[PDB]
């Protein structure tokens, strides 16, 4: 067996790491009308009703959750879809105008003092010659005084002009599947104790990922996926305090939010075939918006998180939780969108505790806004039309985003504070078990076969 010769094989199972462009695939049921959705699944290919997955025995693969290109692609696609959904909508250039506002003191509690303003202004009509006098209700977070009934202006007038969101479109998240082209493949890690980095001993290959809902929030991950066995703590470098920590819950925690005001909507014609949806009067009493969580459930979840956190800091370390440090409203509060409106809740009653080495509810007051700056961009804002009637929504808390404070030496105490901001960490909490590879179906090996002349 010394007269060995080269033999050529085509179709061998080998692969390599690669970066390519994936394409979306939405469910067929999404085609039943409901074309009014920010996530334009109209151009998404229908999914396979029966997805196929192949188990790879004896295969061990290396994953790195913090250097995944899928995250970048998903971020770019989401931003592009958001921008594209706003092109055929009204541009509120004429709204940048001097206002004459006064406080709304009519059947209000003591906590809603100075939060609403009653403003009137001159507006253009469908005819280029004449004008109209109108009025609307604005939240105190959207107006700035310029120098009784002092005069104000919209906060965004000195940076850009806002685009009104088309009232028919809906913001409800819809599952999306990412699929790879021919000649590529997606590997999935089936290990239940995977920590996001290192070799995964259980692997399998698929063509599309499971349905991922693009939920936008901060400090709290909503309507996500749950761990199978235990709370999972993941971080790029746990010993470094400049890197965020991702926590995945074992069981869901319910949160109830509401806006207890019966709002009224008005239609104002500002040009040929263009309308601006103002806020009329409030039918009834005025009260603050809030959210509810169960005290016992939150305590249990925090206890489990603390138990799983001591493995990286020793059994004789004090763990305490404190609220955010500071920054803009979009970073120091738990932001989310609940059926059209945008909330900014004060999660200061949740992270208030200390743990030693050894029925009721929590209410989180929330504010509301109408001028939105998404994706941490500057120069592009959006106006959210008012929603008629009362609002209520329910969802599950699935994870967290934390941050550690740099302490001197080992003071036996560690303090963790919530922190969000970058929205790539939201996607990273779903695509942590996937990677893309490229197939190389050509191989050469020695054998005793020789070509016939």
């Amino acid at each position: 067996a010394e007269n060995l010769w080269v033999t050529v094989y085509y179709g061998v199972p080998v692969w390599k790491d690669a970066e390519t462009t994936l394409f979306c695939a939405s469910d067929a049921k999404a085609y039943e009308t409901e074309k009014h959705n920010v996530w334009a699944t109209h151009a998404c290919v229908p999914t396979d009703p029966n997805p196929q997955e192949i188990h790879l025995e004896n295969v061990t693969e290396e994953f790195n959750m913090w250097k995944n290109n899928m995250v970048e692609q998903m971020h770019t696609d989401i931003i592009s879809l958001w921008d594209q959904s706003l092109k055929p909508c009204v541009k509120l250039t004429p709204l940048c105008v001097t206002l004459q506002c006064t406080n709304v003191t009519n059947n209000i509690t003591d906590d809603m003092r100075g939060e609403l303003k009653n403003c009137s202004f001159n507006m253009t009509t469908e005819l280029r010659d004449k004008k109209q006098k109108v009025y609307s209700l604005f939240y105190r977070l959207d107006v700035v005084q310029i120098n009784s009934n002092k005069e104000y202006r919209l906060i965004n007038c000195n940076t850009s002009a806002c685009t009104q969101a088309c009232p028919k479109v809906s913001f409800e998240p819809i599952p999306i599947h990412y699929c790879a082209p021919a000649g590529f493949a997606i590997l999935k890690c089936k290990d239940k104790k995977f920590n996001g980095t290192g070799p995964c001993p259980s692997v399998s290959t698929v063509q599309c990922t499971h349905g991922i809902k693009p939920v936008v929030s901060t400090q709290l991950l909503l309507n996500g996926s749950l761990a199978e066995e235990e709370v999972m703590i993941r971080s790029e470098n746990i010993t470094n305090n400049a890197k965020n920590i991702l926590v995945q819950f074992n069981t869901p925690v319910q949160i109830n939010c509401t806006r207890p005001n019966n709002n009224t909507r008005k239609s104002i014609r500002i040009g040929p075939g263009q309308a601006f949806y103002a806020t009329g009067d409030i039918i009834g009493d005025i009260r603050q918006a809030h959210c509810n969580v169960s005290k016992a459930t939150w305590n249990e979840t925090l206890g489990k998180v603390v138990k799983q956190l001591r493995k990286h800091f020793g059994n004789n370390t004090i763990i305490r939780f404190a609220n955010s440090s500071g920054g803009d409203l979009e970073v120091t509060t738990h932001s989310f969108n609940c059926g059209g409106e945008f909330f900014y809740c004060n999660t200061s009653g949740l992270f208030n505790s200390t743990w030693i080495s050894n029925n009721d509810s929590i209410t989180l007051p929330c504010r509301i806004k109408q001028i939105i700056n998404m994706w941490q961009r500057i120069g592009q804002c959006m106006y959210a039309p008012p929603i008629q009637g009362v609002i209520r929504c329910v969802s599950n808390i699935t994870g967290l985003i934390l941050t550690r404070d740099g302490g001197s030496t080992n003071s036996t105490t560690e303090t963790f504070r919530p922190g969000g901001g970058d929205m790539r960490d939201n996607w990273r909490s779903e695509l942590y078990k996937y990677k893309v590879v490229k197939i190389e179906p050509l191989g050469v090996a020695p054998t005793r076969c020789k070509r016939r002349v």
């Binding site: 060995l4 080269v6 085509y10 390519t20 020695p446 054998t447």
Partner: protein, 133 residues
């Protein structure tokens, strides 16, 4: 018929099997290498074009080596022990294609040129032989 009596078959199914066992399922991978102005406008077109180009590029190499239209093709180039001195039993019964690729990844380009020149010589000699008649 019962074929080869396998527990199951699928794409990349035999990635963790010995090179001897994985060689009986070449068709499984071969057949899935071709198909198996909005935001999603060009993300569907460029991918298809790239797949076609990769497939044709792979086919051309087999074409110029004389192995067109085949899954297992025998050649006329002797094996050089410098590339690998391992036995014939510990290669086809104790290793996987993924491991084998790493070992000989350095000498892949060397082997490719010999396969081309051998086919060139074969074609020239065949033409001469036919001309003699």
């Amino acid at each position: 018929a019962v074929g080869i009596g396998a527990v199951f078959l699928g794409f990349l199914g035999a990635a963790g099997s010995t090179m001897g066992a994985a060689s009986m399922t070449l068709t499984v991978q071969a057949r899935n290498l071709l198909s198996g102005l909005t935001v999603w406008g060009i993300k569907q077109l460029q991918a298809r074009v790239l797949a076609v180009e990769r497939y044709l590029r792979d086919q051309q190499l087999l074409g110029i080596w004389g192995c067109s239209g085949k899954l297992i093709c025998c050649t006329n180039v002797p094996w050089n022990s410098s590339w690998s001195n391992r036995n014939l039993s510990e290669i086809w019964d104790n290793m996987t294609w993924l491991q084998w690729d790493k070992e000989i990844s350095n000498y892949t380009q060397i082997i490719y040129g010999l396969l081309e020149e051998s086919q060139n010589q074969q074609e020239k000699n065949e033409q001469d032989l036919l001309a003699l008649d």
